[PDB]
Design a protein around this ligand. Structure first.
Ligand SMILES: Nc1nc(=O)c2c(CCc3ccc(C(=O)N[C@@H](CCC(=O)O)C(=O)O)cc3)c[nH]c2[nH]1
Ligand SMILES: Nc1nc(=O)c2c(CCc3ccc(C(=O)N[C@@H](CCC(=O)O)C(=O)O)cc3)c[nH]c2[nH]1
Ligand SMILES: Cc1ncc(COP(=O)(O)O)c(CN[C@@H](CO)C(=O)O)c1O
Ligand SMILES: Cc1ncc(COP(=O)(O)O)c(CN[C@@H](CO)C(=O)O)c1O
Ligand SMILES: Cc1ncc(COP(=O)(O)O)c(CN[C@@H](CO)C(=O)O)c1O
Ligand SMILES: *Cc1c(COP(=O)(O)O)cnc(C)c1O
Lengths: 480, 475, 475, 475
């Protein structure tokens, strides 16, 4: 009686819906759905995943252990997991128009940050040297980072890192100083990859420095991979030895990562011997058995779906719109008196340098957040500290996914400008000059609270008009 | 164009990607019709999968609840904080003595994050030897190559079984540790059929002033249900995956002591110093944005782990494995350590005159999913002498003791077929075995008959996480 | 002003620096009047000292003979080439099978240079534990601190004595090495009274594919004379100091196999790969200009090592130590391993109720130079329980067997005084012992009488390296 | 057989080892007859050599004065304590602000001991690039190989000269240090002809919180005499050899700040933390028994460094080098940095159309001892484009300004012969140059004539450390 009652009970538990089993979690998800419906989402690393990707990520593919590689597994039962991973690899090469005799791919790395660590582990001995764009100048923690205080990224613990920096007069990477630094530092690997950079890489110049230094050229295209797949910006694959990327962000896939690497002939050396690329086995073995265990086959299957979408004409039109929206956004910001780092943009984001407006990014970000415009404060050339940012970073991928077009991003720039004006009013009313005096005014001044409520209402009414991505408005729990 | 990509983003998987949809339908049928005996596998709940497949995936939330780098994380914070508090409750932990990190992406990086938090590069780790039931994420090197990157960045040395008994040789562990001076000792295994002597590991770690890390990935659901002894009584740090016996999404958790540790010889309080180091190793040290969809599904799985029916499930996992072991022993099989006290068994096939690679090939063809596995005494990790099997996944579908007696019977029938294939093989090589297995009409018929028996038995049990009635492949 | 600084450059030490001249005269008297029993000390020849005190000191000669980075080295090349030739001849080595580096400045950096040549940073070394008779330059760390920098830059693990027998526990060494996987194993000691089983070390090194380094510093002169078995029969690399039983200047040599490997060890390379790596680690890796005054003095010492007189000397060293041990045993002293096969003994004072620190303080006051020394069983390495003594230095002055029986008698009388100071000591601590030792007039008189007995006995023997007749201090 | 080996031990070098005695006599004659221009060479005093060749060599004295690990060291303690006292006095150092270690065996291990004391393995060091005049013990690696072991165990990066001016580019050093974050910066060189901007290095070290290490090996005697500015005004740690301009024995010293460094923001004293770390790195970290004969000779040399005659000598060293540089420039040679402010010059032969290897071969044959040396602009490290020369050694023999004008003339005549050999060489490889140099009778006659000119000039000056009248080889 009790034994069978219990067995029926745990089977019911396993087959019941989330709404029935865990209403508290279901409610949180419904609140997050409403949040994604109502906001101006300008964080340039964020996007809205398709329903079909989410259905694959939420499938029974999660149940399987499949250590190894297709057709070379350690466990049985992997006939269909092998189909998915093989299909994912094939679509990954196709999405970037790569010759499979010249390029291989690993689709098992769990996210962007460990993907880079796996490349370093594959190709570098402990304490060998890496150069990458300095984090406050637009780099990423997974390329290394250390302050005067301590090593922040563990890449800087296990490997020896050194940054390269912007030309702070132009806002572009200072390639001349990168080259001169590399002569002295002797990197074994140079990363060409940025997060908060409004320009595209001079991959040809990085390639020249890497050739002279006999360094691996790693392109980390996480922020731009969807633009690359659509063919609307130049491809790092024209030059790089290894290419890493997140599968989320501009690719618009599940949370995950890919590692691409050259295969085949590198050069015939001076003795007439072929030198072959030595990346495939080293990288595949660093991922497994080196640093990961069982692949996440639900994510790999969702990635295959995302990579199919990436080849379509609709996806190319989407990425074209991302760029055109960002240019219109930049146009409108310039017309309204804002300064852009490097003077403009060539991609999906802008960096606004707020110095000429007489207020910093931390104050503006707080007002934007209260009116449901998501952006983030950003270091700009000229800041005295990497902890007091003078700028704001904003981008177009997420709202473009919901159907914002050029005229809509002109409106986004208008509402951003209205938020900046409120921030300046709060600063003017602030009894003091420190950020705590600013937030005290921002939370007690009823007149300025009312202006922010009004602007928040304007933001939400504009955003709500657009389709929701990945779920239906009609079945949302929270329709106000 | 605008309407064009909106439609693409909101279309079903069936509409957008029929090839992937069909692969998932084939995998559903595989999970329905087979004996899934890999002891690290389970069938997770529909509710977990609905959370993992939700829009929680869209948000970037680097940092920790209430201490994020980006805004817009109010509801992500609700989920992660709920997950953390449910994690401590699932193991009946006092939150003033234990903290938890729920962001680690899987079991292997979770262990690497602990080492990065607490050890400098090239500091010393001891753990169970991989061929004796350990795990790659604790270190492993051969005579010629460092296989796990743990053994590249840290200095590793194994401890071993008593090959006479199949239990860990704690006496030799203690003696080795005196000479090797580990800074951290791992108590955890992938292919060990017995309970750990955590008290003995604690004694060695105290003497060596080493961190005691319990890696409970395989047994975490048994621990949560309170049906085997808990490593939290003894350990400094506990890692676990969330997808094995815990029956959650693919992910991991890191638990650590916090608060007051002891009073020194001078009357001063000494506090634990794990929490900040581990949290910072996970982020910003080694990971970026948390996978909020997985964390949300983990919260769901942790609520399930508190229920009476979940405890009944884990008690059944244990009783099923005991019955499974008893039946295998009665049929003449040798088990490493002679039996089991948990969810798995390790069959040593050497006394039957055949190896694990050959038997596993037959199992695969009759729809029994297991893994060939090294046994103590194997001279090459490429020629495994054993098969590893366990009860979590089929117990989730409702297999009870008499059903696992049947599983042992069908395993034995598969071994008998493998022995016939070996006897008929025109050579001694694995490729000769495979050629016979694929060309011999009589033995192909026997395998087809056993496959039909396995599928007919498995099909009668409920499907977990999807509806049998709507499956594409119902035949 | 220029003729005067040239006068100061050519004047004698007596005229230029009477304070230093007086210090040397006091040290000459100390060497004349004492029982010098530290087994690593000797009295080198006048001819060695005249070469070390020559204008060979003025030359920079980085590189190797005939391959220098500076001009002017025609005669420095003759000296280094002659030194190398005599080094190989001193140990009866085939120059087609053995090479030598004579530039290493002393024993400790010589070993570090071998590790740097053959091991990557953090690779693994095994050697005899320091408290069991090993040496710091083979690695050493305590529970809390890495003491030798060898243990900072490389990963070290000790092997130990069998505490019951006092001999190296080779069985435990072999079992430990299986788990630890050393890349290099050191066979050599500072306070081991028995002969090494070099054949057994070779067997373990072969199984582990580890370099066998013999550090023969203490026994090199015995080896050169052929009176004990040679480590060159087995080792890959042999290091030594030149100032202990070899009786040369302060310095070191590194010997290494070269040429074709044994038939069963030839592979991708058929030749040994030690010579270039070791020579390059010495220079340009870790040293600069060779000390050609020392190298020239070493050439002199190596020629002396070939003579029948030198062989007779080393024979007497062994017979003196055997007699010394027998006399100590008959006077009730416990010896580690119960005796000796070489030039030293290690007295364990446990059966006497007093430690090495107390006894050595009395020895020093009665002009007997020895060292307190850890013994097996000591609970702490700061409180050594033994005294180490040996025969090389006094044998050089002509002490024979009956003279070392007298040395043992006077050692015994010193221990008895130490026991009286302990018995009269109020407190239990070493400060109270020293307080008694410096304030008790009766025991101060007994130490004075014993000091006179030691000095009267030692003064009868020839001085080595200088003449009694020109000593400043003749009383 | 006692009487036989005791006579062996007390006989003179002439009696025991005529071959070695002969080599030393040949080297004496070479030091009499040649132009010794290697700027790291000197001629030390007889009194130093008598101390280095004394019975102080016989003592083991591990530890520090008054803190030895065993007995017999009463007089060795006097010598080391006296040497420390004189070391601080020679550089006018306040003993409450500076300490010193006098046990480091030579300059290269002294620097390695400082790194081991103050830096963990793989921490970062900046120093002057070897091809720009730096030293191997500050680090050196090529694209293919780590040459100095400093670059194996630590992470090194060079700073460079302004190749237009030949002075250190301090602006680039500072900018490089921002990016590289060195933990230690070396201010010292082997072939830099200008004075260091120690104040600028101090400012960079302060901004980077890096240790400022001055390696003053080449200039130490100039510093002691007060004829150039002192690195002790700025540096945290100062290393030096003792055998170059200091004019002492072959050895080294490590100086370090001690005592109060600063008061922190809470009013608490902050002490320097160099002394214990450095002393413990020397022993027990990296060395064993001190070389007390060298330490005793060093004490002698340090007393000699205090005299007015010594100051007059170091002033003459500078004036001689200035005139030497002026004469080389007048004869058409290019100097790196266009001149000198210290004891050496570096000739860049590019404008003469010949490399340093060819020129040094002729110098050697005409008894001018110098070294081929890399210069800025050299494409290959193995094809040095320069010749390094300096004045300490011949100034010690009484050369004055007009004499170094003649040295420059004879160097010029040797270069002219080298150019003739090159012109007569049919091939362009160095072996063809050597073949021409050894077979051309006319050019051999010219080298023989120039050799006779060099010897006739050099022989007129006093010999340092020995008397001409007792030279075995006067012809
Ligand atoms: N118990 C157990 N756990 C496992 O995880 C496992 C695996 C998968 C992980 C694994 C992979 C490669 C090697 C490996 O050894 N690779 C070598 C092969 C050659 C050699 O073994 O010397 C290599 O050089 O790659 C060892 C282990 C195989 N057999 C296993 N058994
Ligand atoms: N056999 C033998 N060989 C030796 O060379 C030796 C020595 C001299 C070298 C030495 C110096 C310090 C420590 C040392 O350990 N220092 C510790 C303090 C002691 C401890 O912690 O146990 C430190 O912290 O410095 C250990 C060894 C003392 N006793 C010895 N015995
Ligand atoms: C103790 C332990 N710790 C960590 C892990 C790694 O988890 P991951 O596969 O999610 O990285 C495992 C996985 N173990 C799997 C894969 O080998 C198994 O089949 O046993 C484990 O057993
Ligand atoms: C085996 C061995 N190898 C190396 C050394 C180091 O020689 P060094 O003192 O010249 O550095 C020693 C010194 N041994 C001295 C100091 O401890 C002794 O009294 O025993 C040694 O015994
Ligand atoms: C600045 C500096 N520091 C250290 C050293 C090393 O001294 P050592 O040769 O005694 O090891 C040198 C040696 N310099 C010698 C050998 O290169 C020379 O001819 O210049 C040095 O120039
Ligand atoms: C976001 C990003 C990453 C890291 O991805 P995560 O999934 O957050 O670990 C790595 N590189 C770049 C350039 C990125 O923008």
């Amino acid at each position: 009686s009790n034994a069978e009652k219990s067995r029926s009970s745990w089977i019911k538990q396993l087959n019941a819906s989330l709404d029935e089993i865990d209403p508290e979690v279901a409610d949180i998800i419904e609140l997050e759905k409403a949040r994604q419906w109502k906001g101006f989402e300008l964080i340039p690393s964020e996007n809205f995943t398709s329903l079909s990707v989410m259905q694959a990520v939420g499938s029974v593919m999660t149940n399987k252990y499949s250590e190894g590689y297709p057709g070379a597994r350690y466990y049985g039962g992997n006939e269909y997991i092998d189909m998915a991973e093989t299909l994912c690899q094939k679509r990954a090469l196709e999405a970037f128009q790569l010759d499979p005799s010249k390029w291989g791919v690993n689709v098992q790395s769990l996210s962007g940050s460990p993907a880079n660590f796996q490349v370093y582990t594959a190709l570098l001995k402990p304490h060998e040297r890496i150069m990458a764009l300095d984090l406050p100048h637009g780099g990423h923690l997974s390329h290394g980072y250390q302050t005067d205080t301590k090593k922040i990224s563990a890449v800087s613990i296990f490997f020896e890192t050194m940054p390269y920096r912007l030309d702070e007069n132009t806002g572009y990477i200072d390639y001349d100083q990168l080259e001169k630094s590399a002569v002295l530092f002797r990197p074994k690997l140079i990363v060409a990859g940025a997060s908060a950079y409004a320009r595209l890489y001079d991959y040809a110049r990085i390639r020249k420095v890497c050739n002279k230094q006999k360094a691996v050229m790693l392109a980390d295209m996480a922020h731009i991979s969807g633009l690359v797949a659509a063919g609307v910006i130049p491809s790092p694959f024209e030059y790089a030895d290894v290419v890493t990327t997140t599968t989320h962000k501009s690719l618009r896939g599940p949370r995950g990562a890919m590692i691409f690497f050259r295969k085949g002939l590198k050069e015939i050396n001076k003795q007439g011997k072929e030198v072959m690329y030595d990346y495939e086995d080293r990288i595949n073995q660093a991922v497994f058995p080196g640093l990961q265990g069982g692949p996440h086959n639900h994510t790999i299957t969702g990635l295959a779906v995302a990579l199919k979408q990436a080849r379509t004409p609709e996806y190319k039109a989407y990425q074209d719109q991302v760029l055109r929206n960002c240019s219109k956004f930049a146009e409108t910001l310039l017309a309204k008196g804002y300064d852009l780092v490097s003077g403009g943009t060539d991609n999906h984001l802008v960096l606004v340098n707020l110095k000429n407006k007489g207020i910093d990014g931390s104050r503006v970000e707080k007002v934007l957040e209260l009116v449901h415009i998501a952006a983030n404060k950003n270091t700009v050339p000229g800041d005295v500290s990497a902890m007091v940012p003078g700028g704001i970073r904003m981008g177009t991928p997420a709202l473009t996914s919901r159907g914002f077009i050029e005229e809509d991003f002109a409106k986004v720039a208008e509402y951003f400008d209205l938020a900046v004006k409120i921030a300046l009013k709060i600063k003017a009313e602030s009894q003091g000059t420190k950020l705590k005096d600013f937030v005290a005014t921002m939370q007690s001044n009823e007149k300025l609270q009312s202006e922010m409520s009004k602007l928040r209402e304007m933001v939400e009414e504009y955003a709500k008009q657009f389709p929701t991505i990945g779920f239906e408005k009609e079945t949302m729990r929270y329709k106000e």
